[PDB]
Symmetry: C2
Amino acid sequence: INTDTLERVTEIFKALGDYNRIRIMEALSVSEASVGHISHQLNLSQSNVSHQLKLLKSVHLVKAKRQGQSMIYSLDDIHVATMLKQAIHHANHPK
Amino acid sequence: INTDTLERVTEIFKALGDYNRIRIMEALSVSEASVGHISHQLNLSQSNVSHQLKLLKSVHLVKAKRQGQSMIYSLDDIHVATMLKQAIHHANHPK
Ligand SMILES: [Cl-]
Ligand SMILES: [Cl-]
Ligand SMILES: [Cl-]
Ligand SMILES: [Cl-]
Ligand SMILES: [Zn+2]
Ligand SMILES: [Zn+2]
């Protein structure tokens, strides 16, 4: 399949090969949330979390939507949710 | 969720952040196959393909099964298949 495609896939997985980015993604899989709420959940700086989310948004793994007086991040779409959830499933069984 | 877990997840995604490993995985998503058959499909050395498959087997993304006089590699299980297919889906639509 296409080279522009299999390159976008590698930048997606590349982006996911980082422990705190995975922690951010897995939190978002529970609930969309603001940068402040995420940094509180994970005990990371708002500066650090914001930087990571823009990296993730760069490869279309997260998106950001104004809601009221907050900027709310979410997993981009159902593909991202399913991909992450299957990965965690696989990491948690034997063989 | 657990640190042994979210570390196994990062090594999975880490392992997938490589163009030829993705090409190998995507070929296997079409059909299980021997090292020779893969290296022919992809025009890569058998030495290179074998090295990559042992890396992938290390993080339980592929498995290897004797069948007749051949050693056949496959995607480990349905979780891996779904994860890869969702990633490629996501890479191929807009927004
Ligand atoms: Cl939500
Ligand atoms: Cl922005
Ligand atoms: Cl098959
Ligand atoms: Cl072996
Ligand atoms: Zn599995
Ligand atoms: Zn998608």
